[PDB]
Amino acid sequence: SIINSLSLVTKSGKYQLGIDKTLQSLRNGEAKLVIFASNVAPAHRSLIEYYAMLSGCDILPFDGDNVDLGTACGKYFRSSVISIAGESEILKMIKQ
RNA sequence: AGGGAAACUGGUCAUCAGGCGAACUGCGGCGUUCUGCUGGCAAAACAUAGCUGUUAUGUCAAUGGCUAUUGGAUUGGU
């Protein structure tokens, strides 16, 4: 359901892809929502939700592994976290 | 630490590694091995030459192992 948007995210605007990039984006107050995998590590999973609360940045915990969230964007490798200028298709509604 | 990767790239004799962060850059960090230069150290030891116990010179320069054994390193399989 949400992969319909997340395909068009790659077309529309810029996005970060992993834990090093997403934490730099959250520190700057730049990233406006962020998406977990199921199997993201229990150091980073606790830490990323903390900065998302502090920023006022929206959270979308996606069921399915880093394999599924990797091939959601289309690229042929495993990605635990994707954070995300210009929305793809109304992400205000679809996150809820 | 920076860097932020599909036109996938890097790598082994072989399997492989990477957004849980690769290539790549630092006169990075650190461990274990390595080359050179010393100290120990020529006073010793050894080989020539000569004198009746000791005085002379000399032990140099270059650079491979497809050979073996040993120590160690990097890995794999069962």
Residue A18, number of CB atoms within 10 A of its CB:
12
Q: In this structure, what token pair is assigned to residue A78?
A: 């495993």
In this complex, the answer to whether residue A52 has its CB under 7 A from any atom of chain B, a nucleic strand, is no
- Chain B: bases < 7 Å from a protein Cβ: 3-6, 18-21
Which residue lies nearest B20, CA-to-C1' measured? Answer: A41
In this complex, the answer to whether residue A83 has its CB under 7 A from any atom of chain B, a nucleic strand, is no
Q: What residues have CB less than 8 Å from A6, skipping those under 6 apart?
A: A35, A72, A73, A82, A88
In this complex, the answer to whether residue A71 has its CB under 7 A from any atom of chain B, a nucleic strand, is no
Q: Parallel, antiparallel, or unpaired for β A33-36 and A58-61?
A: parallel
**What 3 state SS string does chain A have?**
CCHHHHHHHHHHCCCCCCHHHHHHHHHHCCCCEEEECCCCCCCHHHHHHHHHHHHCCEEEECCCCHHHHHHHHCCCCCCCCEECCCCCCCHHHHCC
* Structural contact between residues A31 and A9, judged by C-beta atoms closer than 8 angstroms: no
Chain breaks in chain A (C to N over 2.5 A) after: 84
* Structural contact between residues A18 and A81, judged by C-beta atoms closer than 8 angstroms: yes
Report the Cα–Cα distance between both ends of chain A, in Å, rounded.
12
* Structural contact between residues A59 and A52, judged by C-beta atoms closer than 8 angstroms: yes
In this complex, the answer to whether residue A25 has its CB under 7 A from any atom of chain B, a nucleic strand, is no
Resolution of the determined structure in angstroms stands at 3.2
CA–CA gap between residue A32 and residue A34 (Å, rounded): 7
